[PDB]
Subunit: 250 residues, 6 copies
């Protein structure tokens, strides 16, 4: 194989320059499925890769796994393999009152609550999305009539304390992170997720384009247990938008 | 007066909700004079304010002074008088080889090399511009057929050591900043200037919209001395672009 | 399922209170297969879980994924299912001249070059292993006549820049990390890997026991390409040592 | 002009080695006015410069503008123009109960709540005044019978949140700065202002002398709306002291 | 003398490779006294040194004085004088409910609340004990039937605020340290003392072995005034254990 | 005894409110012996205390030990016995070319390269001396016709790496401190020593007065080995200056 982790060769990519990067390997196929010529390429660790065809052009789809570490690996290997553009798609929880389940969030930049973005650029540097990518994502969201919020995302290296969850084994949050949510909510932060700070930092500081869309599945300020159908729907809308954006970016 | 520093009353703004914010109080008159019915409002400290009218709406032009401190005042005091949108206009030195004299840079976000942004958000929070304002700026630039780079700016609390100038009194740069320019250059940083990190972080964390455009008057990678007329042609061009962006944000 | 990510119920563990936690979901089956009555429990994301039986007691094997983020999930969700003891097994590159291919390293504590450990304890808090688990690991190694180094490991949120690899896309290392390897080498650091800083800090600060062993497959100070069989002989050897340590911790 | 910002030539200085540096351009003339041969030299941005004569010796007076950024520029340019000594004069609010409106504060050193002092020396370095300057200021304060307190000043890059003002657009203070005032007051800090940390750091670490006096116009622990007369008086007393000190330092 | 502070020559050591390092000079003789051939060697500053004989082998005993600064000196000089192993012995206050007066604490690693450990290794590095030393100390504690807890110690550069004492001149604790104890107690920290973070950091990062035992004289969660007899007893038990460990390490 | 460490009662001080605080317990007797009616009070640890009488007032001499930890104890415990003024006396190495052997340095403030100052004030807070004590010290020096430099001192938690000494066991300096001396030298730092950062920050933030004088025994820029008599002549000279300053502060 041409790289240490993902188990891909250059040839396998057939000239692809754009990759869509969910976190869940399980979602790779679902996104592959919207375009033409879907083919599983490899499954190793958290990296499930398919290739596909979008208007006669190769496009990759590759899971990052959870967290900046597994993400930094998958970007690095995919870049060594000719991918210049990287679109993340997730599902996510809102942290603002006016966001509703099923709205879409396009991320301009991320609060760097991770460790891997530091290995690319010191904390002062902005975890910012590429303008091209963010635009394609906004317009793509319009072309299917999504309700879209455009804003800052908090990117955490933990699911539990760094997002201020308290229904845990310990039930405590270390002092640094205790009451941090109120701050990010006062500062108009939209949601939490766990791989954008890595993603956007590494791409901005190395000349690669990157962007992020997500669909809202819960709102923690008015928190409802998500309905199976609705999650599924929200997922395909986000999936679709990120494909439409891919199409504009090719 | 209604505010501590600016010497303005709520009535002076006649309902204005958009401010164009250059650094130099000299530039204020120039920019107001491109719009309809300009009237000087006030002048105190580094803060020079004019009111004008664009497509029938009141619009403010207000100078910030150099640096985050005086910016943070201007923005806070305009905000109390009803400004919701802040558009910074400057001229600037590029640090990339591919940007030329006469180009225009629109800033997605800034490297926060300043002290005042921290008094609004901790360093991990992105100094990111408003998407609508960024979009208007780039569209306005394309509308006059500008060559325009869109990306990241390093926002420094000093002109001299923080941008590694060494033709100074001491000729010395502190350790922390010696070699830093090469870092920002490796990382695709376009330019330096001295108010965006403050402006964009305070805005983004407070629900106000901000963006920034600048025209390039020197490249430090291939550095020529500018003649005045080029400066002026370059200032007029960024000025027209900022007023066209204001148009689309009204 | 009882937990957000792992796809496990309390009943699946049949009372298990010890988890062997490799990084790669492939290794899970291998390790369970060395114990009695292995049964696959679940597989979702980077998390592959098996149950087995050792000296008549239930024992879990669960993969963490690469990096602190996904580790912190695994550990938290196992912990809610009753795991009190966590033993990480890996293969690794040594950065010291005196450690050879085929040796075994047991980790006392780790250099916290990751983001997730901070979401449990501030940086001053030691990423230290449990004394009993450390003791069992080293005893188990001596029991098969391993050559075994016991000391400090550098735990990195990246594979590439954080371990100063320069045969990458950019070929660049950020300032903070360029020259860092030589520092860890001066300081007697044995190896790098990517989950221990998280694992050991979250464990030690939450009342759970953790340790880590790894077998050496390359030395970067005298670096040879490994052949597969050596890898496999080396993986089997660390695997047998981890199961013998589990024995003594039951 | 011989410098980038201030619009001065060497010759214009007529051999001056000492500068007095209020923040308000409006105050420049008022200070010039106490000595002989007052002459406006230039007005550009926040930099209003006069020269004057003190016992047959040239002395400059130059506003810095608000904040360490504009201050660092004016010191750098004035130093390139032969100024070795720099006296700041302001008006200020006390934060200690026993200080009264119209007392004088001479600053020994400043709490570094700014960004520009870091561009000269890392945060560990003391923002300390020169002993000569601080002495001249103490004795000058005596020669007109001021009530003087001699102590530490907190130097903030913001007027509003970093001084813990809550009557703002947002009414909030970010977590770092919320409750910081109580700490500085517990630590015997005298007052807040916004340019000494820059001033004293840059001068101490580059072999220039610098000192700071201020007159008290409000006491925030017992806060009264300042009376126009009294402010005017307090201003001329501070102005006078700083001139007397200049005279001793020449 | 062969070193700057301790007032020893190489010869004086007679080939000694292991040193026991209490903090109190007064305790040096008491520890010397358990072995053979006790001889005072020197008394300068806080450094009281005796030599002695343990199974026909030279062993040093040398007080460090309070705090990482005096400790770093005594390790450095003793290392230049051929000491490779360094055992600390103290008496200490527990901060956990289940620890009792007269139990023994062996330290695996220390929370770095000091300044001198930074002069050897940046804060990320673990202040970890050597495995050999920690083992000898555990087993030595067993060979005299101590009740032993094995865990993390918080190492403070102050006795008073950094251990959250409030019966002081000022009665206040600076904001950083106010409520830090609750955090270290939530994180299973055993006790506070003032020289292990220096000790273990300098030794781990320079190839020297080091370990720490202490005996509990007070429990601050259930705080009793210590009884003279019991303190004396606890001291000799700790003293004995650390000698037994020395014997295993020779 | 009234205090935990010093072995003093309130009565022992006979009303003393000024302490001269050398580092070395040997120097205590020397300094008391220059005043009237010296009597040894106590000796425990690095703390040696004498009482004497100067112009009819009781005065204490008390040793601090090397480093902030033991300093912070001494100062706290003296403070509880009524000491309000603390004057440190030392001998020291200069790092500037223009300071010679036999000169005297009086310290305005210190570079806080220690851990204990933080347990009183965060790093941004200046390690600044009391103005009255600084003034007395410099006046006393001029009164015996000392050559005297007045400026900034770097206060280090280590003798060896923190002052970049490389004739050590490892011969290595950690990254953070390698090259740091050249920085302090560029910045006009006079000397290094190991207790002032603690002393001055704890004093200034607690309402106590402190200053420091030292006589120069080596210059590391042109370094000669000192002969004893020069040391002694130099110690007597700083000692006389500190007692003359005490005179003027009584
Ligand atoms: K300004
Ligand atoms: K992962
Ligand atoms: K000491």
């Amino acid at each position: 194989s041409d790289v240490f982790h993902l188990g891909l060769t250059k040839n396998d990519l057939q000239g692809a320059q754009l990759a869509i990067v969910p976190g869940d390997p399980e979602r790779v196929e679902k996104i592959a499925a919207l375009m033409d010529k879907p083919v599983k390429l490899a499954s190793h660790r958290e990296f499930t890769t398919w290739r596909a065809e979008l208007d006669g052009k190769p496009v990759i789809v590759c899971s990052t796994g959870i967290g900046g570490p597994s993400t930094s690996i998958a970007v690095e290997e995919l870049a060594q393999l000719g991918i210049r553009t990287f679109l993340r798609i997730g599902t996510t929880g809102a942290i603002q009152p006016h966001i509703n389940v099923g709205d879409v969030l396009v991320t301009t930049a991320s609060v760097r609550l991770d460790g891997a973005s530091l290995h690319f650029a010191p904390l002062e540097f902005p975890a910012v999305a590429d303008f091209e990518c963010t635009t394609a994502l906004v317009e793509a969201a319009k072309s299917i009539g999504a309700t879209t919020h455009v804003g800052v995302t908090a990117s955490s290296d933990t699911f539990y304390p760094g997002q201020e969850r308290y229904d845990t084994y310990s039930g405590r949050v270390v002092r640094h992170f205790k009451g941090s949510m109120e701050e990010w909510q006062a500062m108009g932060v939209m949601n939490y997720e766990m791989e954008s700070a890595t993603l956007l930092t590494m791409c901005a500081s190395q000349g690669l384009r990157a962007g992020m869309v997500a669909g809202v599945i819960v709102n923690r300020t008015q928190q409802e247990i998500p309905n199976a159908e609705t999650m599924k729907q929200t997922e395909s809308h986000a999936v679709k938008i990120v494909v439409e954006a891919a199409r504009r970016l090719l």
